[PDB]
Amino acid sequence: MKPACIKALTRIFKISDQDNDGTLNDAELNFFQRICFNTPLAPQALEDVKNVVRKHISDGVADSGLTLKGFLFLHTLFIETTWTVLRRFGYDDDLDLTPEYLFPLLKIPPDCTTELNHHAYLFLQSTFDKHDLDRDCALSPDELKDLFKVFPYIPWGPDVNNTVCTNERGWITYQGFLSQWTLTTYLDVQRCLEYLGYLGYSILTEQESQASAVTVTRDKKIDLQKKQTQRNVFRCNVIGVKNCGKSGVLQALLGRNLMRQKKIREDHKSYYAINTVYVYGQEKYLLLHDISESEFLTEAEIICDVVCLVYDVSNPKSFEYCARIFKQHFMDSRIPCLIVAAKSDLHEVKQEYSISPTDFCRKHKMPPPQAFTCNTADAPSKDIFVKLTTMAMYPHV
Ligand SMILES: Nc1nc2c(ncn2[C@@H]2O[C@H](COP(=O)(O)OP(=O)(O)O)[C@@H](O)[C@H]2O)c(=O)[nH]1
Ligand SMILES: Nc1nc2c(ncn2[C@@H]2O[C@H](COP(=O)(O)OP(=O)(O)O)[C@@H](O)[C@H]2O)c(=O)[nH]1
Ligand SMILES: [Ca+2]
Ligand SMILES: [Ca+2]
Ligand SMILES: [Mg+2]
């Protein structure tokens, strides 16, 4: 009994256990045995095997449901029947998941983005619910480990807990869970597809590949000619000098004030932050990318749906950078731009730049500088996030 074979079957069992209760009920048994073969046998002829398990082992059937040990036992009983099941779940002759299963072909045209379609979100909603055993709409570390049992490695670093919404204890909430998949689909779609394969998405939803979960948006250029978009996820690059408050902006989207932010650790620090934002009654995803001050602004880190140029009102040299980067990359750009006067809770000093932030915005047809602070008693104001998303949806309005 090769250890590798048992590992595959255990994962197959875990995937086939769709309600995640520990056993395979007859509904799940019919489904598995249908997709692997052809026709679910007589409901009584099903126990013509379900009692066979009962009279060899005493832990193979629990509450009229086939257990893992029973599942593994039935594998032993057969030994081609096994390889049919294995190949149906995407394994090859070396008991590894095939590249065709994990990495399906999904090529995205330039200036297009990737989102999860409606049914894909539903799968993740179901997935979340099956692993939320205490029913608190949040995934504890133990519940997360349970989820990752069908993963060859841990798919999420502990920095994810500051990229999306979490509860009091810092556990990924229901919306934070969806936000993380939304973010992953956007940035690294082939990683998302690989993870969907691990969850057995294509198998359970009975589709051609994992790529069937991904919606590929149209060219951004067309969105600007038509002057309207159908995208639900927009990316905003957050640019500003060192310690100007960029990270504070990202965590403010997650509803965390400066007090709450101070408890973030070693490698907790994320440079992305995503959450739902409502624009005129329309629910959209806002995707913030923290651009740490570097020697260069590449084409890579200046491409977005809206730019957030942040400066520090307590720093007299901070705004000069915003003006510099703007003239350099976004002055004659189709990309909307918003200037944010961060740390507004601090005393406002004079910016050493020749022109004032107000006059600068007035001169270049920008909105007036938006005052912002994350140092508040409760959750910070989400005003700038609503404005950023609005500008991303409706550029020149
Ligand atoms: N690891 C890493 N550090 C970087 C990178 N780019 C810039 N930094 C450093 O990050 C610091 C500036 O970050 P800052 O602008 O304050 O934004 P923050 O990352 O949110 O703190 C400087 O010490 C940079 O050298 C990068 O790609 N990787
Ligand atoms: N008073 C005040 N301090 C802030 C605010 N936001 C950030 N800070 C402090 O400013 C420093 C830099 O903030 P951070 O978000 O790390 O900036 P970044 O390095 O540019 O991303 C930290 O010491 C923060 O505690 C704010 O709204 N008010
Ligand atoms: Ca079950
Ligand atoms: Ca839970
Ligand atoms: Mg910094």
- 272-279 and 172-173 beta bridge pairing: unpaired
CA 208: distance to chain centroid? Answer: 22
- Contact, 321 vs 355, CB < 8 A? no
Please indicate the experimental technique that yielded this structure.
Answer: X-ray
- Contact, 367 vs 332, CB < 8 A? no
Radius of gyration of the chain (CA): 26
Residue 297: count of CB within 10 angstroms of its CB: 17
Q: Domains of the chain, with CATH numbers?
A: 1-95 (1.10.238.10), 97-290+394-395 (1.10.238.10), 291-393 (3.40.50.300)
Amino acid type, 157: G
Those residues whose beta carbon sits under 5 angstroms from the ion ligand 4 are 132, 134, 136, 143
Ligand 2, atom 26: closest residue by C-alpha: 343
Cα distances (Å, whole numbers) of residue 221 to 185, 227, 229, 330: 21, 9, 10, 16
Cα distances (Å, whole numbers) of residue 334 to 113, 391, 396: 17, 12, 9
Instruction: Give the C-alpha separation, 85 to 89, whole Å.
Output: 6
Strand partners, 310: 340
| Reported resolution, Å | 2.5
Amino acid type, 274: I
Binding-site residues sit at 17, 19, 21, 23, 28, 132, 134, 136, 138, 143, 243-248, 262, 269, 292-293, 343, 345, 373-375
Residue 369 DSSP class? P
From the CA of 246, the nearest ligand is 2
Helices (H), ranges, 188-279: 189-198, 201-204, 220-225, 246-253, 258-261
- Contact, 129 vs 138, CB < 8 A? no
Q: Which of 379, 304, 311, 315 is nearest to 337 (CA)?
A: 304
- Contact, 146 vs 131, CB < 8 A? yes
Instruction: Give the C-alpha separation, 251 to 355, whole Å.
Output: 30
Binding-site residues for GDP sit at 243-248, 262, 269, 292-293, 343, 345, 373-375
**Closest ligand 1 atom to the C-alpha of 240?**
15
Among 269, 293, 296, 309, which is best to mutate for testing ligand 1, by the most ligand atoms less than 8 A from CB?
293
